[PDB]
Amino acid sequence: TFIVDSRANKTEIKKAMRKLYQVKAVKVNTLIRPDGLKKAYIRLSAAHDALDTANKIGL
Amino acid sequence: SHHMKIKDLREKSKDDLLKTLTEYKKELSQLRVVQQTGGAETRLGRIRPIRKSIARILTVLNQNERSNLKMFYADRKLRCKTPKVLRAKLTHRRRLALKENEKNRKTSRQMRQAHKFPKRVYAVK
Amino acid sequence: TKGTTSMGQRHGRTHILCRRCGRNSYHVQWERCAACAYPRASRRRYNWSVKAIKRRRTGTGRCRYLKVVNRRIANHFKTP
Amino acid sequence: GRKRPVHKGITYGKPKTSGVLGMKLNKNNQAVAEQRLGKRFGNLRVLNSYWVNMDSTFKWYEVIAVDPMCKTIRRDPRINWIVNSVHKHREQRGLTSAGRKHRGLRHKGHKASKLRPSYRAAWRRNNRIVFLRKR
Amino acid sequence: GRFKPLAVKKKYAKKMNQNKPVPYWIRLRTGNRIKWNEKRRHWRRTKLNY
Amino acid sequence: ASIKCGSRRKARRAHFQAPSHVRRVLMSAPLSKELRAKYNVRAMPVRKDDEVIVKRGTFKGREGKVTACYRLKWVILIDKVNREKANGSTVAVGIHPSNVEITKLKLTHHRKSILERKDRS
Amino acid sequence: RWHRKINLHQKRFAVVSALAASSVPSLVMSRGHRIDNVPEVPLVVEDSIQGY
RNA sequence: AACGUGUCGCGAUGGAUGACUUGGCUUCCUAUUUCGUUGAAGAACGCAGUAAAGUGCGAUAAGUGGUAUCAAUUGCAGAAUCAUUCAAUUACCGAAUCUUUGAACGCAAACGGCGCAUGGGAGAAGCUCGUGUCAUCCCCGUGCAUGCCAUACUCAGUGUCGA
RNA sequence: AGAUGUGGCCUGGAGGUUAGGACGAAGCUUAUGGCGUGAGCCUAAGAUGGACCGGCCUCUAGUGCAGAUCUUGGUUGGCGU
RNA sequence: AGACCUGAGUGUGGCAGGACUACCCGCCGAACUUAAGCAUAUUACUCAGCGGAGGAAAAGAAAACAACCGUGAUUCUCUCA
Numbered sequence A: 001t002f003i004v005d006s007r008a009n010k011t012e013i014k015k016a017m018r019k020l021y022q023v024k025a026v027k028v029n030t031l032i033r034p035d036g037l038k039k040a041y042i043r044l045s046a047a048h049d050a051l052d053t054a055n056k057i058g059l
Numbered sequence B: 001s002h003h004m005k006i007k008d009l010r011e012k013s014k015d016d017l018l019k020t021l022t023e024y025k026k027e028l029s030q031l032r033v034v035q036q037t038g039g040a041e042t043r044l045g046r047i048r049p050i051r052k053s054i055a056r057i058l059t060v061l062n063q064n065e066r067s068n069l070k071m072f073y074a075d076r077k078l079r080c081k082t083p084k085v086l087r088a089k090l091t092h093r094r095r096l097a098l099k100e101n102e103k104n105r106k107t108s109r110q111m112r113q114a115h116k117f118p119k120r121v122y123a124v125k
Numbered sequence C: 001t002k003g004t005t006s007m008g009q010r011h012g013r014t015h016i017l018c019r020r021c022g023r024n025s026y027h028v029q030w031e032r033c034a035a036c037a038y039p040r041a042s043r044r045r046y047n048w049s050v051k052a053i054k055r056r057r058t059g060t061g062r063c064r065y066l067k068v069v070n071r072r073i074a075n076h077f078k079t080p
Numbered sequence D: 001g002r003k004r005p006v007h008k009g010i011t012y013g014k015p016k017t018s019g020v021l022g023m024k025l026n027k028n029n030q031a032v033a034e035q036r037l038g039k040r041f042g043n044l045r046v047l048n049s050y051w052v053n054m055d056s057t058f059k060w061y062e063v064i065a066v067d068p069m070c071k072t073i074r075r076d077p078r079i080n081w082i083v084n085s086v087h088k089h090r091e092q093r094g095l096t097s098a099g100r101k102h103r104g105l106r107h108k109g110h111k112a113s114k115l116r117p118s119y120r121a122a123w124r125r126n127n128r129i130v131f132l133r134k135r
Numbered sequence E: 001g002r003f004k005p006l007a008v009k010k011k012y013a014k015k016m017n018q019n020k021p022v023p024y025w026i027r028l029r030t031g032n033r034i035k036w037n038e039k040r041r042h043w044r045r046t047k048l049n050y
Numbered sequence F: 001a002s003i004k005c006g007s008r009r010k011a012r013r014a015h016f017q018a019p020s021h022v023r024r025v026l027m028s029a030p031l032s033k034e035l036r037a038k039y040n041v042r043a044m045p046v047r048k049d050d051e052v053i054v055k056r057g058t059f060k061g062r063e064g065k066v067t068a069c070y071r072l073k074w075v076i077l078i079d080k081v082n083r084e085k086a087n088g089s090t091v092a093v094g095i096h097p098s099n100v101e102i103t104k105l106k107l108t109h110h111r112k113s114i115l116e117r118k119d120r121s
Numbered sequence G: 001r002w003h004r005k006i007n008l009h010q011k012r013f014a015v016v017s018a019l020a021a022s023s024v025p026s027l028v029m030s031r032g033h034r035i036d037n038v039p040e041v042p043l044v045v046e047d048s049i050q051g052y
Numbered sequence H: 001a002a003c004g005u006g007u008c009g010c011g012a013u014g015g016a017u018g019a020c021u022u023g024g025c026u027u028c029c030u031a032u033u034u035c036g037u038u039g040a041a042g043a044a045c046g047c048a049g050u051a052a053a054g055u056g057c058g059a060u061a062a063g064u065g066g067u068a069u070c071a072a073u074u075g076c077a078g079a080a081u082c083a084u085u086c087a088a089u090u091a092c093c094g095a096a097u098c099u100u101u102g103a104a105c106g107c108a109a110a111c112g113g114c115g116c117a118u119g120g121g122a123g124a125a126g127c128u129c130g131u132g133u134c135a136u137c138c139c140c141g142u143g144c145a146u147g148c149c150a151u152a153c154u155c156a157g158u159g160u161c162g163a
Numbered sequence I: 001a002g003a004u005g006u007g008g009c010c011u012g013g014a015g016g017u018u019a020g021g022a023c024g025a026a027g028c029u030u031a032u033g034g035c036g037u038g039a040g041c042c043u044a045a046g047a048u049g050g051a052c053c054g055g056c057c058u059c060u061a062g063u064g065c066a067g068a069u070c071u072u073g074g075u076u077g078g079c080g081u
Numbered sequence J: 001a002g003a004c005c006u007g008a009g010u011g012u013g014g015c016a017g018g019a020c021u022a023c024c025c026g027c028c029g030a031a032c033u034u035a036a037g038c039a040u041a042u043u044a045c046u047c048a049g050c051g052g053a054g055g056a057a058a059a060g061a062a063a064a065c066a067a068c069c070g071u072g073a074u075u076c077u078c079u080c081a
């Protein structure tokens, strides 16, 4: 789950989740919040562990 | 801490300046995760010195692009295809106004009467 | 009746927000703003209300460019 | 003539201001022709016009305009004054020859004393209550 | 209801992020003027009508 | 600075709405007469870490080192000039630099360039 | 009306009258001035003070 | 008696008066003093370690550059050096940045919408001898409102000729 | 009703003069008396205040309240109804 | 075939559009009011409305005034009045 910029589509969020983070997004479900921000749920490709990515990010 | 001085930053090339811009956009992006997951007040708090040094790399990159493009259109007779972002921005009214190579244009007779009868300096006693 | 009961019969919106005016003055059936006359190129300005003239005037907002161009003229368009 | 555009010919108030059809505009049609050109072709500075032809319905005027951004006009001394931005719409302010006609500036002496430089320039001058300082 | 334009949703989102109180350290500055927020909007008392 | 003029309302506005480079000159202190007589300068803008002695107030006759020039509060902070709160914790008490003369200067080669500029010789 | 205009002779005859009364030492003294040690009224000094 | 009434002393309620005044109002003066398609004024949304409003600024976002100043800012944190520049801070200004709009101008519009040319990008399918290349899809730049002036090619006309 | 006179009183500021104030100015308070026909002035006491101000001669004006279904703020009987 | 004339289409280089509008230029243009009524007249060739510039604008270089012993572009001031 990431806050992304509110003027990106789901295709360019997948391509940024490949160049920053060396993982493969199979499904992005975006959501412009009542805060005003766009939140994306980004499911990884089951060849990539979610905790192993989230430790490298650190959270 | 890490803080790009601009005097050692203007001596870089266009490739090394971009390579240290991705270096510092990446370091800012992994402090936006410690700004959301708690964060010690020392690691966080390098957010201004990074974000103002990104502003120094981009102002060296952009001042080197307008310098190498203003010296691409004033070089020769290509100054009709000069894009208007590079032209001398004045007031809108001052660009349309008559230049002073113009506007002192005068008739062959108006030149003669200022040469046959010029305004004299004189006194009185 | 015309008092309390008829207040509940008011359902829609006459005006929505103006894309230019800023205000809740854009008429929906007649596509025109009650306050800045948008989409007309000129804005509403009437000397029978100078108090409204003094509210939509230069300097009531931010003046992003008249800040910079007034000192460009005051410093006589200097250039190194 | 000028039909007064009151709704349905109905107008109000004092009977001197009741007429609709016999009223006449205070600008001649040559000035009105020059203003319709220059309000329509904004990049051109019109200087004066002249009578061409009449019909029973229409009058025609050739209005001479000049392009102020043309490099010929800017470099030519006897026409480059038109490029200065005080002549931007000479027609809309009564500064052409037909404008100076309906202002009365064909006359100079005792026939124009109420209207030199303008009627408003003489109205203001003749009616402003002057307060001298020590009086 | 469900339909809103996104430009109305983003104006309604600004007013949620403005509806927060003055923090306490504002009240401890030198030339202080602000005790409370004077613009605390409540959804029932005053209507935005976007 | 030239704050004083004919109009009080304008003079008293340019004092209390002064930038911190104007507030530095306005927050000046005299020099001690063994130090005024050396540099031939009569007063000096106060820096941090230069030593002063206090001449007006309840803290008059107190020496010490300047630890903060708090220009927003128009005051100075000497370490040796302080008191305690209800907790027993100590807090530094502000003095205006009028009430204070300098007994040692903190010198840099931008501060040694102000003394050569104000040198009356 | 802020400013007033006074006749030219009546401004001159008022400057003269206030100038005549400076010679009277009773009127200079009854106006506040401490002239108790002054040599003479009208006091007149030399022009060496115009070079101090 | 009780209630009540009156007078003084002390309390409360109330927020006048005085003193104060970084504000208004009025007058007078000095200029290489007058915005915008090179996108203005206005409107919108954002930007701080902490930040609602306001101020300042624009994804370089409470600012970057340069000059002058010469050790702060300070509510609390943080911070190479503790100061001939190359990192205080403030003031000033030449170099820049300047989101979405708006005359608003590719077409629309209670749509963060959709084009036609053109260039760049990314590209886990294919093809290639993991590299390259890369179909749709998806991003980004630029050109394109209309009128007019000048201009250098393609035309229309049983307009007048002409072979 | 009205006119007029007043070395008649009072308030803000200005020109002059003469003086007060941290040993306590302005303001406020009154079973504080004094004296003026009166408008008013002055003293005293504050177990009040905390920094400005008086008198006289001239000059000037946004200069004197009890009521305008007066304006604005507050309070009150009705009423613990 | 070609020309000339009158019109098109694109390419290229430009410009106009909105803001301000105190003053100023062009138009448009009232009524309350005053006349102790009211209609001419007055308010006023003013308010409001529309268009257009500038640092000022507008005017200006005699188809002028005069009737003199003559004057000499415009603008403004005092006066004329």
Ligand SMILES: NC[C@@H]1O[C@H](O[C@H]2[C@@H](O)[C@H](O[C@@H]3[C@@H](O)[C@H](N)C[C@H](N)[C@H]3O[C@H]3O[C@H](CO)[C@@H](O)[C@H](O)[C@H]3N)O[C@@H]2CO)[C@H](N)[C@@H](O)[C@@H]1O
Binding pocket: D135, G001
């Ligand atoms: N005394 C009544 C007041 O008089 C004031 O005005 C007075 C004077 O200011 C005013 O004087 C005017 C003068 O101002 C103006 N500049 C010129 C005029 N010549 C003067 O008038 C003068 O001459 C006339 C006759 O010519 C006399 O009738 C008049 O009394 C005299 N003052 O005439 C009034 C006579 O005293 C105000 N109008 C006003 O405050 C009030 O009516």
Ligand SMILES: [Mg+2]
Binding pocket: none
């Ligand atoms: Mg005249």
Ligand SMILES: [Mg+2]
Binding pocket: none
């Ligand atoms: Mg559009």
Ligand SMILES: [Mg+2]
Binding pocket: I062
């Ligand atoms: Mg009064």
Ligand SMILES: [Mg+2]
Binding pocket: none
């Ligand atoms: Mg316009």
Ligand SMILES: [Mg+2]
Binding pocket: J033
């Ligand atoms: Mg009236």
Ligand SMILES: [Mg+2]
Binding pocket: J036
């Ligand atoms: Mg009447």
Ligand SMILES: [Mg+2]
Binding pocket: C047
């Ligand atoms: Mg008007």
Ligand SMILES: [Mg+2]
Binding pocket: none
């Ligand atoms: Mg002119």
